[PDB]
Structure 1
Amino acid sequence: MMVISEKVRKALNDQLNREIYSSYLYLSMATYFDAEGFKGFAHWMKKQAQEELTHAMKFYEYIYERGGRVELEAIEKPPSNWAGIKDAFEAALKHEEFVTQSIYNILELASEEKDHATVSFLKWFVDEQVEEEDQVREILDLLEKAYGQMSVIFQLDRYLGQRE
């Protein structure tokens, strides 16, 4: 029997679908980088793509642990194109910043319902969102010091290309 409220379980099932769209958007950003020929920026986006699926599946399993069930919704067609590589990472950071407020809302909800289990579970994601945002800001700060200079963008592309 479901020991999570339907309201809270909807909030988790939504953020779940939100993390899948997160992976999808990133995969799409890989299509952008691959098209412009930065195979290393593309490699990074694909790796973030599958990291988001591991986020999705943490919500998947917690929902069933508390006796819920997941309904996968439709996935919106994500953007296909950005200005510079700086613009895509700005869209990345904005999306990440939107994802962390999505999670704060689920947190604040469960806090009102005194569902301490969901309140606790959700803290891994509060910490990982600090890392995910910071990952992106560091990249943007280096982009803006490349200042177009492409010997440096090569050094970035080759580098991000080495993420495991």
Structure 2
Amino acid sequence: VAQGPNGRALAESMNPDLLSAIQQHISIERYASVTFLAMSIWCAERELAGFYQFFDGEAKDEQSHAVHFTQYLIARSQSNDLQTLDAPRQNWDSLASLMATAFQMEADTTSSIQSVYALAERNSDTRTTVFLDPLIEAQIQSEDQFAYLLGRVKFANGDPTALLVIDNELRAGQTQRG
């Protein structure tokens, strides 16, 4: 039995480019998490308590996604490499602008998973493509959800009354088309 780079028994070697891409994607998930924390704070500073609670939970969810990836590397007997985390964006001129950033970031997280997916396919690493399939499925749902939140906020057209109504929706947990 061979030993993997992290010292565990090795079921199948992983190409170093694919390992590096996964380690990078983990940073992408951790960065999404701290970004959602920053967004939570921005909403709290403006008394948008529903949006604050929503993003507080999103930050914890994204961190869970990052950890899920670290567990996969452990299972593949590959080394993790937790990287320096950049500071998040912390300033927006409007809630609509913030939600645009939030949606774009979810789409960018999917684009990163897609890049890892294509590299695994190039390497014929079907453990990795199988591992990623449900994560892409969850990204489709998150993209649908953040498109809904963004579109609803833009529908409000900057009217505080409408934004308070949506804020109360989010506080109640009404965060998707359903």
TM-score over 0.5 for the pair = yes
Identity %: 24
What amino acid is aligned across from residue 63 of structure 2 in structure 1? L
Q: CA deviation at 1:93?
A: 0.8
What amino acid is aligned across from residue 20 of structure 1 in structure 2? R
Q: Superposition pairs for residues 64-83 of structure 1, below 5 Å?
A: 64-83=74-93
Match of 1:27 among 37, 56, 59: 37
Q: CA deviation at 1:115?
A: 0.6
Is the contact made by 1:20 and 1:53 (CA closer than 8 Å) also made in structure 2? yes
RMSD of aligned residue pairs (Cα, Å):
1.3
Is 2:102 the partner of 1:84?
no
Residue deviations 1:117-140, cap 9 Å, x none? 001101111111111111111011
Segments of 5+ residues of structure 1 without an aligned counterpart are none
Q: Superposition pairs for residues 75-154 of structure 1, below 5 Å?
A: 75-154=85-164
Q: CA deviation at 1:158?
A: 1.1
Q: 1-side partners of 2:172 and 2:20: how far apart?
A: 38
> Scaled by the length of structure 2, what TM-score is found?
0.88
**Number of residue equivalences:** 164
What amino acid is aligned across from residue 127 of structure 1 in structure 2? E
Residue 42 of structure 1 is matched in structure 2 by: 52
What amino acid is aligned across from residue 120 of structure 1 in structure 2? V
Residue deviations 1:85-127, cap 9 Å, x none? 0000100111111111111110000101101100110111111
Residue 20 of structure 2 is matched in structure 1 by: 10
Q: CA deviation at 1:162?
A: 2.7
Q: CA deviation at 1:151?
A: 2.3
Residue 161 of structure 1 is matched in structure 2 by: 171
Is the contact made by 1:4 and 1:67 (CA closer than 8 Å) also made in structure 2? no
Residue 65 of structure 2 is matched in structure 1 by: 55
SS at 1:122 equivalent: helix
SS at 1:53 equivalent: helix
Q: CA deviation at 1:14?
A: 1.0
What amino acid is aligned across from residue 104 of structure 1 in structure 2? Q
Runs of 4 or more consecutive aligned structure 1 residues displaced over 3 Å after TM superposition: none
